[PDB]
């Protein structure tokens, strides 16, 4: 059993969008019994809430749904998870940082953009954006996802 966790800084833009593509992904794939699939935030000030609408309207306008409520990443997160990709550098600084205060870290802690094909390394954040940057962040998900799918590293 694999397992991935999808983080970013409130956990209501992004990484619900990376979670619900991934597990679309694996669906499809016909491999989601065998697959762990989440996402979390760093900041707990999110927790509790639903993506955002135009998060939900992107998925939707893709034919998927999300029941993800935010969530903050814990302790256990790092110790359980084989993977934690997170969005942008401000991101990875905080997780790498965590990672080190952990005693019990399993996770490999990486850009989600450093899978994209199109090598664009930074999932940058939508919320103070239009709909057409979770459109983008979607499409960054689809490709990220697919090649993380193929081959990890």
């Known amino acids: 059993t694999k397992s991935v966790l999808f983080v970013c800084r409130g956990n209501k833009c992004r990484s619900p969008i990376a979670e619900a593509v991934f597990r679309k992904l694996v669906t499809d ?3 989601s019994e065998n697959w ?3 996402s979390g935030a760093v900041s707990d000030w999110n ?3 639903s993506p955002d609408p ?9 034919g998927i749904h999300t029941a993800h409520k935010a969530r903050q990443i814990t302790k256990e997160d790092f110790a359980t998870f084989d993977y934690i990709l997170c969005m942008d550098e401000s991101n990875l600084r905080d997780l790498n940082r965590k990672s080190n205060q952990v005693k019990t870290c399993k996770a490999k802690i990486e850009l989600l953009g450093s899978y994209d094909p199109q090598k664009q390394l930074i999932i940058e954040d939508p919320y103070y954006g239009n709909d057409s940057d979770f459109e983008t962040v979607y499409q960054q998900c689809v490709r990220c996802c697919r090649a993380f799918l193929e081959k990890a590293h």
Do not use: W
């Open 47 to 49: 927790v509790g809430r």
């Open 54 to 62: 135009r998060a939900v309207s992107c998925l939707r306008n893709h």
């Open 29 to 31: 794939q016909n491999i």
């Open 36 to 38: 762990v699939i989440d």
